[PDB]
Amino acid sequence: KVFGRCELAAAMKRHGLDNYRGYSLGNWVCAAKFESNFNTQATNRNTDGSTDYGILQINSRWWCNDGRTPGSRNLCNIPCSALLSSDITASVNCAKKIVSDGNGMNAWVAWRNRCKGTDVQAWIRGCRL
């Protein structure tokens, strides 16, 4: 599913991501924009042979099992395929675990390089939230 900007914001908010660990909703939307262009079916292979899945491009090395990432962990205890669903519940729950683990949203390279330090609230501008 390709989400609309405001449509994902509301979904992200209903699932409790707005100010989760201090990160305003606009940070989460910005990250999704630049990780997946709001597309739940987004998949991208990493050089180490792991793969990133979903709206927030969560990585098979540590977080989910895709059965093809040697030495992987599955800390969110899920099939990476669950991260591709129209229902973003699994992606959000998993995102919550990741962002809680010491490094904050720096875990998302596109967030660090494209959102951090910007006017991230522009990303929820004009949404009815």
Side-chain angles (χ1 to χ4, degrees):
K1 173 173 169 180
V2 182
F3 271 81
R5 177 181 61 97
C6 293
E7 182 196 20
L8 180 62
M12 277 179 150
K13 186 176 186 183
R14 167 220 158 206
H15 288 284
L17 227 47
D18 179 22
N19 278 296
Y20 190 88
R21 290 309 182 118
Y23 293 91
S24 64
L25 193 57
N27 283 287
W28 291 107
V29 173
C30 182
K33 167 66 180 168
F34 291 131
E35 291 283 2
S36 72
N37 207 23
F38 296 145
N39 182 5
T40 67
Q41 304 197 68
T43 61
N44 284 286
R45 198 80 185 252
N46 305 139
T47 53
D48 59 13
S50 63
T51 302
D52 283 358
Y53 299 86
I55 38 164
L56 290 168
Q57 289 294 275
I58 287 167
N59 186 280
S60 64
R61 179 39 181 83
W62 296 98
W63 305 112
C64 61
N65 178 61
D66 68 0
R68 77 173 194 180
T69 308
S72 94
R73 319 175 96 194
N74 177 8
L75 294 161
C76 295
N77 286 284
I78 42 155
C80 296
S81 72
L83 301 174
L84 297 185
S85 154
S86 40
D87 182 348
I88 68 160
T89 292
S91 276
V92 169
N93 277 330
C94 191
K96 283 176 180 179
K97 297 185 169 276
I98 292 173
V99 80
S100 286
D101 84 357
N103 195 40
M105 288 200 74
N106 290 293
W108 286 275
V109 184
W111 182 80
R112 185 170 38 85
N113 287 338
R114 307 189 66 180
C115 301
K116 175 184 186 165
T118 70
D119 184 13
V120 294
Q121 295 289 72
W123 286 102
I124 59 171
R125 203 159 290 169
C127 305
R128 205 174 167 87
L129 301 159

